[PDB]
Amino acid sequence: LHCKRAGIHTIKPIAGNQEVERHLTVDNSYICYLWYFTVVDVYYNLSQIVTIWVYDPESASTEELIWTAKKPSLSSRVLTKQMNTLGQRPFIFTVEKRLTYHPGPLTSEGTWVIHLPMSSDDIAKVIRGNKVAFQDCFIANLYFMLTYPMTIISEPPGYEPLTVPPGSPLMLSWDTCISTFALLATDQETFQTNDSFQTWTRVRAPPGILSDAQRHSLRDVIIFDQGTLFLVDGTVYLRTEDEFTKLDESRGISETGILGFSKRRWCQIRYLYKLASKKSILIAWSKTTVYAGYATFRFVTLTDTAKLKDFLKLPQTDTLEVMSVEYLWHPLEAAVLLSHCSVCTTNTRNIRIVIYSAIFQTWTLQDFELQLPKEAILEFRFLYSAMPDIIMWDQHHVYYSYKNFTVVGTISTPSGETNLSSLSQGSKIHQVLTDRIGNVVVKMENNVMFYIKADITEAVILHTWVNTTAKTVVLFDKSFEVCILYYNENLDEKYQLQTQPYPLILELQSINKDLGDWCPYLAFQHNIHSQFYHMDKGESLTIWSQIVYPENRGLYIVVEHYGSSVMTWTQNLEYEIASGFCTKTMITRFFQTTNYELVDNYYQLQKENTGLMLLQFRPSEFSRTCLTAKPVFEIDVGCDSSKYIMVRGFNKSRCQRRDFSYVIDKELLDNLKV
Amino acid sequence: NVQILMEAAPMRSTGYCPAEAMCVLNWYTPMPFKNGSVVSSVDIYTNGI
Amino acid sequence: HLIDVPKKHHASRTESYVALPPLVSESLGFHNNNTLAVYQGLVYYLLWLHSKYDKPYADPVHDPTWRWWQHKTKDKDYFFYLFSNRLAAEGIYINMNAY
Amino acid sequence: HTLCRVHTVRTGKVFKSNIQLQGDPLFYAFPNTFVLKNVCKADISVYLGQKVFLTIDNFESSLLPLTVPKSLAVGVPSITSAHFVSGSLVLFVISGKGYSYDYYENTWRKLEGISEPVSHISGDVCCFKGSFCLELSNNLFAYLRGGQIPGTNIYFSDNGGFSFQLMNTDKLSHLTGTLGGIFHLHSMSQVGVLMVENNLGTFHYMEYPLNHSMGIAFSYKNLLEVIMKPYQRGFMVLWNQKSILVSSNSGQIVEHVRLIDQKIFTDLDVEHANINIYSVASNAYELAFLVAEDHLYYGSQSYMGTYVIKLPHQPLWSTHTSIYFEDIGILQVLTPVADPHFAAYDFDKCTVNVQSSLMDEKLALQPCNVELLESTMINTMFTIDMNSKLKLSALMIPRKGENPTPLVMVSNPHALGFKANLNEFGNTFDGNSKYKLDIELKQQHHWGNSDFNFTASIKRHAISSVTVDIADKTLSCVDLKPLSTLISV
Amino acid sequence: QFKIIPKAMSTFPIPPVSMVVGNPGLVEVKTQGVFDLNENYYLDIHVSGRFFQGSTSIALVLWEGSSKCYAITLLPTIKSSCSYLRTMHHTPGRH
Amino acid sequence: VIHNKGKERTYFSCSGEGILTGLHTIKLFLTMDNLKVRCFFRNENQSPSKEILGLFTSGGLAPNMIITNSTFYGGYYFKLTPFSNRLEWLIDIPRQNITVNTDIAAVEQWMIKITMHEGLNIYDTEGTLLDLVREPILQWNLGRVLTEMEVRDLYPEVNDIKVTKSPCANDVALIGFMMKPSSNGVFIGKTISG
Amino acid sequence: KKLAIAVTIADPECLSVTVTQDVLLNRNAVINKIKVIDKKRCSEQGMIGRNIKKTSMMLKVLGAPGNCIQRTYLGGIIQGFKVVPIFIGCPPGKRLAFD
Numbered sequence A: 001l002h003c004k005r006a007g008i009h010t011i012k013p014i015a016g017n018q019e020v021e022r023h024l025t026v027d028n029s030y031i032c033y034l035w036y037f038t039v040v041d042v043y044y045n046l047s048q049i050v051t052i053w054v055y056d057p058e059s060a061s062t063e064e065l066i067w068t069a070k071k072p073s074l075s076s077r078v079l080t081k082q083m084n085t086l087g088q089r090p091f092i093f094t095v096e097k098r099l100t101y102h103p104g105p106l107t108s109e110g111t112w113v114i115h116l117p118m119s120s121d122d123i124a125k126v127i128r129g130n131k132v133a134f135q136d137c138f139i140a141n142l143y144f145m146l147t148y149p150m151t152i153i154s155e156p157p158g159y160e161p162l163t164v165p166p167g168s169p170l171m172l173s174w175d176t177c178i179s180t181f182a183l184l185a186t187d188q189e190t191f192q193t194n195d196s197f198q199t200w201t202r203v204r205a206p207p208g209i210l211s212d213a214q215r216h217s218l219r220d221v222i223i224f225d226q227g228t229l230f231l232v233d234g235t236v237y238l239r240t241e242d243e244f245t246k247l248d249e250s251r252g253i254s255e256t257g258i259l260g261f262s263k264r265r266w267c268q269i270r271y272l273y274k275l276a277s278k279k280s281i282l283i284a285w286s287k288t289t290v291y292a293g294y295a296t297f298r299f300v301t302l303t304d305t306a307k308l309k310d311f312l313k314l315p316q317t318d319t320l321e322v323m324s325v326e327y328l329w330h331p332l333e334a335a336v337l338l339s340h341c342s343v344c345t346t347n348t349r350n351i352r353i354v355i356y357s358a359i360f361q362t363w364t365l366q367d368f369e370l371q372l373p374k375e376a377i378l379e380f381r382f383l384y385s386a387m388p389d390i391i392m393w394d395q396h397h398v399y400y401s402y403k404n405f406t407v408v409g410t411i412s413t414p415s416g417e418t419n420l421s422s423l424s425q426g427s428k429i430h431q432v433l434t435d436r437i438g439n440v441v442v443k444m445e446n447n448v449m450f451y452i453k454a455d456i457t458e459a460v461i462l463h464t465w466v467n468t469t470a471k472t473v474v475l476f477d478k479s480f481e482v483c484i485l486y487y488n489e490n491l492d493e494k495y496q497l498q499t500q501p502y503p504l505i506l507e508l509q510s511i512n513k514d515l516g517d518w519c520p521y522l523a524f525q526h527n528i529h530s531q532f533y534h535m536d537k538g539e540s541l542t543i544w545s546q547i548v549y550p551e552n553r554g555l556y557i558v559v560e561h562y563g564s565s566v567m568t569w570t571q572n573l574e575y576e577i578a579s580g581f582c583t584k585t586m587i588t589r590f591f592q593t594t595n596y597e598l599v600d601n602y603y604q605l606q607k608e609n610t611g612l613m614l615l616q617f618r619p620s621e622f623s624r625t626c627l628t629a630k631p632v633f634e635i636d637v638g639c640d641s642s643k644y645i646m647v648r649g650f651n652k653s654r655c656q657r658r659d660f661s662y663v664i665d666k667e668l669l670d671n672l673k674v
Numbered sequence B: 001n002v003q004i005l006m007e008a009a010p011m012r013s014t015g016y017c018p019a020e021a022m023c024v025l026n027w028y029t030p031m032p033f034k035n036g037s038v039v040s041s042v043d044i045y046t047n048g049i
Numbered sequence C: 001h002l003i004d005v006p007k008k009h010h011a012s013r014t015e016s017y018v019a020l021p022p023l024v025s026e027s028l029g030f031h032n033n034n035t036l037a038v039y040q041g042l043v044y045y046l047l048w049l050h051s052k053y054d055k056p057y058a059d060p061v062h063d064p065t066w067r068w069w070q071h072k073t074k075d076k077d078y079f080f081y082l083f084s085n086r087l088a089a090e091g092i093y094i095n096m097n098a099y
Numbered sequence D: 001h002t003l004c005r006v007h008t009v010r011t012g013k014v015f016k017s018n019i020q021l022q023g024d025p026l027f028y029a030f031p032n033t034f035v036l037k038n039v040c041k042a043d044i045s046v047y048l049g050q051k052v053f054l055t056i057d058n059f060e061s062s063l064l065p066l067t068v069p070k071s072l073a074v075g076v077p078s079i080t081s082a083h084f085v086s087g088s089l090v091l092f093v094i095s096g097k098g099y100s101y102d103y104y105e106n107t108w109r110k111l112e113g114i115s116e117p118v119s120h121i122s123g124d125v126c127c128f129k130g131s132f133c134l135e136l137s138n139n140l141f142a143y144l145r146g147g148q149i150p151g152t153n154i155y156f157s158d159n160g161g162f163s164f165q166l167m168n169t170d171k172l173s174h175l176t177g178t179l180g181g182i183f184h185l186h187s188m189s190q191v192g193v194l195m196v197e198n199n200l201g202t203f204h205y206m207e208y209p210l211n212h213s214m215g216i217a218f219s220y221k222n223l224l225e226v227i228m229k230p231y232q233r234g235f236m237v238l239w240n241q242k243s244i245l246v247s248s249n250s251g252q253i254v255e256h257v258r259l260i261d262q263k264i265f266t267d268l269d270v271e272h273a274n275i276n277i278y279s280v281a282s283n284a285y286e287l288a289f290l291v292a293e294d295h296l297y298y299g300s301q302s303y304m305g306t307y308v309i310k311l312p313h314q315p316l317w318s319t320h321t322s323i324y325f326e327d328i329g330i331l332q333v334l335t336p337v338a339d340p341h342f343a344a345y346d347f348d349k350c351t352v353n354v355q356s357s358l359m360d361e362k363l364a365l366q367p368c369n370v371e372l373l374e375s376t377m378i379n380t381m382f383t384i385d386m387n388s389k390l391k392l393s394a395l396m397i398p399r400k401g402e403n404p405t406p407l408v409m410v411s412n413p414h415a416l417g418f419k420a421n422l423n424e425f426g427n428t429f430d431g432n433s434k435y436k437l438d439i440e441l442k443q444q445h446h447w448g449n450s451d452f453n454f455t456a457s458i459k460r461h462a463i464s465s466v467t468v469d470i471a472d473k474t475l476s477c478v479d480l481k482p483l484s485t486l487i488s489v
Numbered sequence E: 001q002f003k004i005i006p007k008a009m010s011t012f013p014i015p016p017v018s019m020v021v022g023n024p025g026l027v028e029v030k031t032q033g034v035f036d037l038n039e040n041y042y043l044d045i046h047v048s049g050r051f052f053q054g055s056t057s058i059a060l061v062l063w064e065g066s067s068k069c070y071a072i073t074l075l076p077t078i079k080s081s082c083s084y085l086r087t088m089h090h091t092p093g094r095h
Numbered sequence F: 001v002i003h004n005k006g007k008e009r010t011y012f013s014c015s016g017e018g019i020l021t022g023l024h025t026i027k028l029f030l031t032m033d034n035l036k037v038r039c040f041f042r043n044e045n046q047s048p049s050k051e052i053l054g055l056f057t058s059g060g061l062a063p064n065m066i067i068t069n070s071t072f073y074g075g076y077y078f079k080l081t082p083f084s085n086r087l088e089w090l091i092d093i094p095r096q097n098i099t100v101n102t103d104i105a106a107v108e109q110w111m112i113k114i115t116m117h118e119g120l121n122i123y124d125t126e127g128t129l130l131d132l133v134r135e136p137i138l139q140w141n142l143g144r145v146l147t148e149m150e151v152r153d154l155y156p157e158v159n160d161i162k163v164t165k166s167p168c169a170n171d172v173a174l175i176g177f178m179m180k181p182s183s184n185g186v187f188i189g190k191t192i193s194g
Numbered sequence G: 001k002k003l004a005i006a007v008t009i010a011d012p013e014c015l016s017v018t019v020t021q022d023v024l025l026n027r028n029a030v031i032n033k034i035k036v037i038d039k040k041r042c043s044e045q046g047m048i049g050r051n052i053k054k055t056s057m058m059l060k061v062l063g064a065p066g067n068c069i070q071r072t073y074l075g076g077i078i079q080g081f082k083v084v085p086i087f088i089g090c091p092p093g094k095r096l097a098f099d
């Protein structure tokens, strides 16, 4: 299908049965072409070499569309040299720290070569260029990530496969910082991939370690760079490229008790690296005890249920249990779901949340008023927000807690059934995916998908896109777009795992065109270009933001803070009305105003006014059809332990010498040999 | 490259002139040329009145 | 709008001279043969001064016409007195800031 | 649907927590319900109704009722008038005796200066950082409304609210009638009294500028409640069960209120329209009142009278509600709901977005006639000494079609003279012309444009407020607030 | 100096003010006129005498302006005399 | 200062109480006594009011009167006075502040502009002021003055009308009657207020 | 996507062209600051006109030329597209002199 006139177009396949019609929105754009890069890693110099050219997605080769190319095609080469003649050059710009890298001249084949350090601290990068157009067409910037290459395991012959129980839905877990490195557990095999499942390598176990029945009861998996963790029948096993050693009491876990484990979900790499202290990378739970796994895979018990029973003033001899633990967006905090019986003898149980703070090593009890039956199992996740806002599900429903545990309830359809099994032919919830922008996708084992927006209660049932019997999963590509992965055995081993993208935004726009919702503001801009701000005694932070909205619907910019308040704000506001649009422009400044001169307990006051806090900016009222990403950042006060002083002309080891020894006497404040 | 800006001076044409003061009347200015060139652009406009 | 633009003459690197005609004390305001001849002579001398400023010795002041109007500008007011009251020359007032 | 969507706030009831109140509860002494808002510490507020709630937050969480700990014999615990002094202290008037309450601690203090039973405590609060108006917020008056002036005792204090000493009766010897209030009118640096000689009432001033003077008399059926606008511009609102009046001056002219309907205005008499007002909320520039037959009126109060319109219908009145201005252009209806299962009160809130609600086609209000009004004279306060002058500036962009007339006014024209120039420079990218207006201010005597009856002394200090406003601003110009500042000579 | 602000489409190349001088023989008039970004027009006029000798009128007319405008034609008068306020004084210094 | 910005209302009504004229404009006459003029703010209520005046004299705002000529500009300030007793604004100017000469010559009229503030001109109202002791034509007696009902019987004989101006100051025209030859007499009427 | 300003350099190894953007939504304004700098190559020391290298830069709004006509009195003008010639060498009108 081709067309040139813009707008919305209604397309429909007329067939024997009833097929729904779809509205596709097409708009004119002056951005047409794209960047393509290929990396190579050299470890002797600890560096990366990237090669970049320009390609057009309409007239490209087949390889350049699936990211498997090494040499530019004829169209890409000709386009690259034509845009080089007009004066276009790409440069790579690191995001966390603002350093730029420039290319050399164009080589014999169309290729710009840029050299780059290996960082592991600033892994987010953009690749950009000048404002040079070819024939009224631009090139779009490209966002990407790269770190040290991560090796996937190899397979020795004679090993045995590890499977999920028969008939159970296949599961997937990926790395928290760099995606396209994931492990998928199925009913017949376990796969691991260094890309988005283009090439894959199986994961197996040495003979004799586990029984055949045990090999078919894998409950959960988790994936790190060092190795993989399996939860086989309530026992945690560790698979590394060397051995398949089983965790026991010698490493701080119990046997045949473990119910689950979890890792971090948001890539807070910068604060974790700059912390200069190794913290936990995993948390496990066994229905009566939470454990906090550090690196090298050994851990001490975090908390038993008796201490929490003492904390919650409970009248003792009560059935108090744990069901899930998650790492929220605060980098040094955890949350745990607490199931409470209340003199039992019924099927109804209370669900509460207890928050554990590691900086202060304390516990807090929150506001939850949720009753649930015994049979329900719960899984909850934290959204991209400074404040704790959870999305929780129990394989028939989805409950929500928004705006600091005030807006708590059940997510419902516009009809109001509130049961997602009745709209999905009686199938249970299989997967829930959150993202940075704020959109959640709920997928059942029937392969039907619902959509939720954060801070929005109503759900939207999306149109059917995939079959009923297909064995699928949902994942993310190199960018943060959704992709559906089809798995089918009885094939030629080259098509057992096929990935196709899912255009979620277009389907949402079609649904909205059917419905008729709208975004109440025209625009919301800010200058928060980062996530981690650090500042010393004598500095302040200036944050700028602006809303442009229709004529007199009274809006404003809500600033929300979480953590320890150690600062002050001053906000200045400007209001303008022009051409039927109002504009509200706000500048806010963060500063500290304490004096340490001639005071007692200088170090105690210095410690009392240090730490981190979290801020988020958002518009006053918003709904769907708003593609704004809500800015969330953190400010820490304290020294980074990487800044110091040096006298000029001096250095550690530019001047080579040997050992010295000398005696000093009669001039100290008797005989010193040093 | 050189510019020169001038203002044209009125002058009466010598003829019969049946009337007393005014008759055929024109505006005159010198034509200056410098050594090293053969091409001159001459832009005429009004003084605003 | 094309705003914040550099100056035309400075960017294109052109020198510019101004030469206005000498005034007349005739009641109607017309010129004649001799007044136009004086205009031609003054414009010629201005261009000759421009072309003769290629001297390799630096003068204290720019604007080569400074060498022209230096020994005569000490008594400009007197000249005006002779022209306003019509007691001078052919009723021609040769200004000094006009060339 | 329209107006508000209700939302309940309740916390602290997650488990079986045993919390119980202790002592005799506090209740208001009038049928109406009020929300008194502290000026700069805007989070702290007091809801006075059938039960009294003192909140440190913006009426978030659940609040236990304020209670008297019975260590001191208050008798019947009825609050008649509350005030906020500078600090962490609030002043109540219970059973004719003044009391102070600290809400950061739990300390009650008995005010010992007052001897005769009083019924109202009045005073002004400045909230600019410094030590000048920290002293200005320490002069407090204590009086009994409805007493006979020859005979009754009026108290005053200058040390915040620690000790109350008696104020001499020689000043009010010639004044006859029943008093309806004595006020520290810091707008004109005066002390005003409100006299009720007959069914009409009037204001009498004390200090030498207009000493032994009077204002234009107004009707005084029954008693009245007087509300000061909190920016020392002199604006006053006087309201009771069956009337409402607005004083644009410092009490010199007290007039009625207009009402807008189908772009014609009519004077609004409460009694003749057969309505009863229940709650009144007052911002720096705005006014709003809720009428007991489920009605909400919103009005802009300024010079050249006030304009009050009727907002669209919504069932807000529930025997306990009270409006309070959460923010400029954001009204809030707050209703406490009891709970005996946990012995605590949770809250129901509507946030009314008045700017959007003033956009219906049924009302059809012509939009804002000024596009931009901006200055940097609102952040701080200014001082003038003798033989010195100061300059202020403001930038105004008007609408594409209309022709609005700016105006600068002074609270105290006896001790503050100004000259304002408005000149045009440049114009914006659309084509509208920017206007810059600069005001030069100095002492009124040095200008020379006043009689000896008007200048009123030069050896004493005074305070005044300078206001830049638009004379013919319409309604629905909610966010384009007029500029005002405090200038101390 | 005068400024002209347009309420509708203006004449961009052509200056919108046409000026005539009644007696060009006694008065020397030099005008400058420029346009602005929003097509506002700024013009300034310098007026001096010619020699020792009357009066004249200078007329600025908005030719494209309508006949319902309040002010279309501006007519300053220039007199080549001395004002009634032009005298000479001698301060004696004793006061 | 914009010429066609738009003036459509007359906010002020000022009178000198010496000679009454049409209320639609403000015409003032200067004699050997002081020019003493009382002015008030005209609104939807055309009568004077003690409320709007007290509203204006509480922000330090008093009217200003600008007298202008073909060669002269002068400003005169009303005094700020308590609103306790008055109803209208009042100002008296000695004659010597405007003109010091008292001879008979050709003197122009003056244009008067009343406003609430000078630089921040908000409520402008226009009018005229005429000198009476220096006007040449007003010193003479033209002829015998016809009373009423002596000009009403003149109406069926009139055939045409003529007017004059006295170029320097208008509003002092003479209106002359051209009549049928059945009647006899030179008939000229005089105006002082246009 | 909607309103873009694009540049184009001839011989881009001797000229650096950069564009800075600013956007105001209520006023409907987009300010574009275009800075052209020399890259210190592509000429040699000479005499006024002996070492002049002629380049250019083209500046266009995307989609503009041919469709946008500014209509004034006495005609209309094609807009949205400009070609600027640039002469890199040493400019005429510079001398050295004995102080």
Ligand SMILES: *[C@@H]1O[C@H](CO)[C@@H](O[C@@H]2O[C@H](CO)[C@@H](O[C@@H]3O[C@H](CO[C@@H]4O[C@H](CO)[C@@H](O)[C@H](O[C@@H]5O[C@H](CO)[C@@H](O)[C@H](O)[C@@H]5O)[C@@H]4O)[C@@H](O)[C@H](O[C@@H]4O[C@H](CO)[C@@H](O)[C@H](O)[C@@H]4O[C@@H]4O[C@H](CO)[C@@H](O)[C@H](O)[C@@H]4O)[C@@H]3O)[C@H](O)[C@H]2NC(C)=O)[C@H](O)[C@H]1NC(C)=O
Binding pocket: E084, E087, F069, F070, F071, F072, F097, F098, F099, F100, F101, F103, F107, F108
């Ligand atoms: C528009 O409207 C304005 C309104 O003001 C009008 O302005 C007025 O124009 C008048 C011209 O007709 C001006 O009159 C001139 O006044 C001169 C003296 O001015 C003095 O100024 C002093 C400081 O301000 C002031 O103190 C003084 O006060 C007076 O002094 C008199 C003594 O001179 C005295 O009698 C008065 O009682 C009063 O105390 C003055 O105001 C005069 O010199 C001038 O010409 C004289 O005229 C008289 C009588 O005709 C004659 O006897 C005398 O000789 C002068 O004639 C000539 O004087 C010049 C010097 O100026 C000599 O060189 C000659 O040889 C002659 O002798 C005239 O009267 C008036 O001042 C001015 N008002 C203001 C406020 O500026 C405009 O003219 C109007 N415009 C139009 C177009 O109509």
Ligand SMILES: *[C@@H]1O[C@H](CO)[C@@H](O[C@@H]2O[C@H](CO)[C@@H](O[C@@H]3O[C@H](CO[C@@H]4O[C@H](CO[C@@H]5O[C@H](CO)[C@@H](O)[C@H](O)[C@@H]5O)[C@@H](O)[C@H](O[C@@H]5O[C@H](CO)[C@@H](O)[C@H](O)[C@@H]5O)[C@@H]4O)[C@@H](O)[C@H](O[C@@H]4O[C@H](CO)[C@@H](O)[C@H](O)[C@@H]4O)[C@@H]3O)[C@H](O)[C@H]2NC(C)=O)[C@H](O)[C@H]1NC(C)=O
Binding pocket: A466, A467, A468, A469, A470, A486, A492, A494, A495, A498
């Ligand atoms: C419910 O919905 C599910 C979702 O679709 C259904 O799952 C489907 O099951 C089918 C069988 O059960 C699968 O069909 C098989 O597909 C194999 C794929 O082979 C390769 O296919 C790609 C692309 O496939 C199609 O291409 C067209 C082209 O326009 C697309 O438009 C279309 O959308 C679809 O994607 C081809 O491009 C390949 O050709 C070559 O690929 C090379 C890459 O390796 C490339 O380099 C080269 O240049 C060529 O392009 C392949 O053709 C077929 O091969 C299977 O056919 C069999 O193949 C074997 C081996 O070749 C033959 O020996 C044999 O005779 C037979 O031909 C088979 O058709 C289907 O893929 C799968 N859906 C998806 C999305 O994976 C489910 O079945 C549904 N359930 C019910 C009950 O209906």
Ligand SMILES: *[C@@H]1O[C@H](CO)[C@@H](O[C@@H]2O[C@H](CO)[C@@H](O[C@@H]3O[C@H](CO)[C@@H](O)[C@H](O)[C@@H]3O)[C@H](O)[C@H]2NC(C)=O)[C@H](O)[C@H]1NC(C)=O
Binding pocket: A042, A045, A047, A104, A115
């Ligand atoms: C870190 O070490 C690597 C080791 O490979 C360095 O890569 C090498 O860089 C040199 C220098 O450019 C390359 O040599 C020459 O490069 C030019 C580029 O124009 C090319 O034209 C020549 O033909 C020649 O190759 C060399 O090829 C390259 N190595 C490889 C394998 O490509 C890298 O430069 C080092 N980085 C830093 C910052 O020191």
Ligand SMILES: *[C@@H]1O[C@H](CO)[C@@H](O[C@@H]2O[C@H](CO)[C@@H](O[C@@H]3O[C@H](CO)[C@@H](O)[C@H](O)[C@@H]3O)[C@H](O)[C@H]2NC(C)=O)[C@H](O)[C@H]1NC(C)=O
Binding pocket: A364, A365, A366, A367, A404, A405, A561, D011
């Ligand atoms: C988001 O919601 C949480 C949950 O209510 C808020 O935490 C609450 O914070 C207040 C103030 O810090 C705590 O009040 C405490 O009261 C005791 C006396 O009762 C006092 O001694 C303490 O000093 C403190 O003031 C309250 O306990 C706490 N709630 C819980 C469950 O811990 C939080 O403030 C909310 N966030 C925002 C931005 O409003």
Ligand SMILES: *[C@@H]1O[C@H](CO)[C@@H](O[C@@H]2O[C@H](CO)[C@@H](O[C@@H]3O[C@H](CO)[C@@H](O)[C@H](O)[C@@H]3O)[C@H](O)[C@H]2NC(C)=O)[C@H](O)[C@H]1NC(C)=O
Binding pocket: B033, B034, B035
């Ligand atoms: C082009 O360049 C030539 C050469 O400089 C200029 O011609 C020269 O002009 C000067 C003065 O106009 C002549 O000097 C005079 O020569 C006469 C005749 O001998 C003598 O009587 C004077 O005392 C004075 O020396 C000079 O001879 C003449 N050169 C030649 C070769 O004829 C010419 O003016 C330049 N063109 C323009 C348009 O300026």
Ligand SMILES: *[C@@H]1O[C@H](CO)[C@@H](O[C@@H]2O[C@H](CO)[C@@H](O)[C@H](O)[C@H]2NC(C)=O)[C@H](O)[C@H]1NC(C)=O
Binding pocket: D451, D452, D453, F081, F082, F084, F085, F090
């Ligand atoms: C304040 O003093 C002024 C003085 O000018 C009083 O003005 C009076 O005005 C009337 C009418 O113009 C005159 O008849 C009086 O003679 C003036 N009084 C004096 C003392 O000259 C003004 O009335 C006074 N105001 C008050 C309230 O006393």
Ligand SMILES: *[C@@H]1O[C@H](CO)[C@@H](O)[C@H](O)[C@H]1NC(C)=O
Binding pocket: D207, D208, D209, D211, D212
């Ligand atoms: C009080 O007012 C009278 C006039 O009403 C005045 O004479 C007296 O001086 C004033 N006294 C004071 C103290 O202001």
Ligand SMILES: *[C@@H]1O[C@H](CO)[C@@H](O)[C@H](O)[C@H]1NC(C)=O
Binding pocket: F076, F077, F091, F092, F093, F094, F097
């Ligand atoms: C008239 O002039 C005198 C002398 O300067 C001045 O005192 C007086 O105030 C003036 N009159 C007015 C009304 O300004």
